[PDB]
């Protein structure tokens, strides 16, 4: 995972999961793990800026990566899930 930017350690009704998010800066590719686990895979794309939403775990849980611009050229990703939420950046 040469690109990882961000991983989150959630609990949810059905145990702990883990969410690993790869973005490229370059190639805008952005590939979200769940678990190890790809469940989105987007190879390339010109916008770096927005959002991917997916289903975690048995019970399908509804989780958003935002990416947002900030300072310096870099990015915050932030998950969100059932109204809570972790920023990362570096």
Same mark, same amino acid.
Request: hydrophobic share 50%; glycine share 0%.
């Given at each position: 995972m040469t690109d990882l930017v961000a991983v989150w350690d959630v609990a949810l009704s059905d145990g702990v999961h883990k969410i690993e998010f790869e973005h490229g800066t370059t190639s805008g590719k952005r590939v979200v793990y769940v678990d190890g686990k790809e469940?989105?895979? $987007?190879?390339?794309?010109? $916008?770096?800026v927005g959002k991917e939403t997916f289903y975690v775990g048995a019970a399908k849980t509804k989780a958003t990566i935002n990416i947002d611009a900030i300072s310096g050229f870099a990015y915050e990703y932030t998950l969100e899930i059932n109204g809570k939420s972790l920023k990362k950046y570096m």
């Open positions: 469940e989105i895979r $987007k190879e390339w794309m010109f $916008k770096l």
